[PDB]
Amino acid sequence: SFEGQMAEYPTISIDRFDRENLRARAYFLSHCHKDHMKGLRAPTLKRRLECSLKVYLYCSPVTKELLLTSPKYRFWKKRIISIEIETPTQISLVDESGEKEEIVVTLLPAGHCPGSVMFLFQGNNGTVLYTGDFRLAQGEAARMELLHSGGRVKDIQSVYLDTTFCDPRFYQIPSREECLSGVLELVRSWITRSPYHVVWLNCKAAYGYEYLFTNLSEELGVQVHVNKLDMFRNMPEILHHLTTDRNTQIHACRHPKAEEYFQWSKLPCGITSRNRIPLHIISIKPSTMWFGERSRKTNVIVRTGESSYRACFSFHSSYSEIKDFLSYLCPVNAYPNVIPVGTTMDKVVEILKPLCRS
Ligand SMILES: [Zn+2]
Ligand SMILES: [Zn+2]
Ligand SMILES: [Zn+2]
């Protein structure tokens, strides 16, 4: 995985805050996932911030809001600067010991989770793009006007990108909309049977399922049960689709023994009945599904039991989407941020090399 520094601008650190990143002139956070926050509240970083006072953390407005709902990251409050989306922003990078560098940064939406962005950096050592984690459908990058200069793509020296599914096996993944529609109709078909029919959405403990919860809630007139919603206190379009009350037909609550509970007709939050009538529960597990280059799309819903389902859902681009994105960017260099499970860095680097100028 990416270790925080791009070769072209080593004085900035993105999505990694330990080790060599303790000497950054500026920090950037693409989104609030733990794997991109390593060292972000380490005592050594706090120590370092107390002496170096012109060092800031930059992120999207939503990332700022989410980060600071955690008590443990509140110390960042005085040093966090949000940057508006697709608003090129001049940043000064001071050597605390004479040097001054200026860069321009533009935040582009990444489609990965609330607040998730890509960072385009422009300065006197070339233009580089750090994608963070992204899921962009074919055509979306071409519509981003700030990736372009006079009708063609900007000259991009290096792209540091999300290669989670950068393997030909993961050729195509169903779109966001297809995934949502499949889950929507499954839930609708169940919870309209009676008030005692309920769904458990078995989700990972991470941001990124909120557009699923909001659309289910908006379309079906039901709030989704969650463990904690205080991070969305100041986010009305998300907040009002969620609830901490157990008395609802859609649940996205969690705990360590949640899957055992479901096998005994119990939701994670412990509700098993209403008016002493047993709830009729189905489980739906958002899970990445894909199809090969020479294959056809199949159902986004996969039944795994009498009462259990998997539902296509992806946080990251498919291989065909990565290739399309990088082909379009046509950078000099492309560096993988992520080595997939059963592959190597050489395999990934060489997959992408044909799309690059060097
Ligand atoms: Zn992520
Ligand atoms: Zn990640
Ligand atoms: Zn619940």
UniProtKB/Swiss-Prot annotation:
GO terms for cellular component: Golgi apparatus; nonhomologous end joining complex; nucleoplasm. This is Protein artemis. It is found in: Nucleus. It is linked to Severe combined immunodeficiency autosomal recessive T-cell-negative/B-cell-negative/NK-cell-positive with sensitivity to ionizing radiation: A form of severe combined immunodeficiency, a genetically and clinically heterogeneous group of rare congenital disorders characterized by impairment of both humoral and cell-mediated immunity, leukopenia, and low or absent antibody levels. Patients present in infancy with recurrent, persistent infections by opportunistic organisms. GO terms for molecular function: 5'-3' DNA exonuclease activity; 5'-3' exonuclease activity; damaged DNA binding; endonuclease activity; single-stranded DNA endodeoxyribonuclease activity. Belongs to the DNA repair metallo-beta-lactamase (DRMBL) family. It comes from the Eukaryota. Changing H316A: Abolishes PRKDC-dependent endonuclease activity and V(D)J recombination. GO terms for biological process: adaptive immune response; B cell differentiation; double-strand break repair via nonhomologous end joining; interstrand cross-link repair; response to ionizing radiation; telomere maintenance; V(D)J recombination. It is an enzyme of class 3 (hydrolase). Interacts with LIG4; the interaction is direct. Interacts with ATM. Interacts with BRCA1. Interacts with PRKDC. Interacts with TP53BP1. Also exhibits ATM- and phosphorylation-dependent interaction with the MRN complex, composed of MRE11, RAD50, and NBN. Nuclease involved in DNA non-homologous end joining (NHEJ); required for double-strand break repair and V(D)J recombination. Required for V(D)J recombination, the process by which exons encoding the antigen-binding domains of immunoglobulins and T-cell receptor proteins are assembled from individual V, (D), and J gene segments. V(D)J recombination is initiated by the lymphoid specific RAG endonuclease complex, which generates site specific DNA double strand breaks (DSBs). These DSBs present two types of DNA end structures: hairpin sealed coding ends and phosphorylated blunt signal ends. Changing H33A: Abolishes PRKDC-dependent endonuclease activity and V(D)J recombination. Its EC number is 3.1.-.-. Changing H36A: Reduces PRKDC-dependent endonuclease activity, although V(D)J recombination is largely normal. The gene is DCLRE1C.
